[PDB]
Amino acid sequence: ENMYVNKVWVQCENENCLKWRLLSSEDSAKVDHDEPWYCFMNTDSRYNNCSISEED
Amino acid sequence: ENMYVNKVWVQCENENCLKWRLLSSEDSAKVDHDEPWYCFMNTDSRYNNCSISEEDF
Amino acid sequence: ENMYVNKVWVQCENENCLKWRLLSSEDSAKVDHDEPWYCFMNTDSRYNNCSISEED
Amino acid sequence: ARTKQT
Ligand SMILES: [Zn+2]
Ligand SMILES: [Zn+2]
Ligand SMILES: [Zn+2]
């Protein structure tokens, strides 16, 4: 059943990176914004590393 | 008249979410205790999405 | 320049319809939260009418 | 629904 979960942008907290990443609905529900978030935590395999450019 | 309904916390049953949401008096009276509840069912537009962080307790 | 706007779900307020719609980032920014929202206000031409089924 | 009284 559809839970109608928004796709949210989160920023990598690696000071060398600081890139913004758009999360799936699933990851947007799962993320805990009171803990640090880093690119490697993104389950989107297109955009899941600080070496990868921000999405267009 | 005034119905004197207390506000309740309800837990989202989206397995990805599981956040606790504080309902208005009106929503708290309406909650069907025998059915699943999910964040989108909250009429509180500040906390009505699984993406929105849990209010402090 | 990317404004990092979330893609949000909104419910149609036509009492005959009540379908949920997932908005583009641009439409998500533009939503007036002080006014009712209805399907026809979606610029997504796939899901922009009360007579169209809710998206999977 | 799982609930907690305030
Ligand atoms: Zn990064
Ligand atoms: Zn939820
Ligand atoms: Zn509609």
From TrEMBL, chain D:
Domain of life: Eukaryota
Family recorded in the similarity comment: Belongs to the histone H3 family.
Protein name: H3.3 histone B
Residues of the full protein shown: 2 to 7 of 151
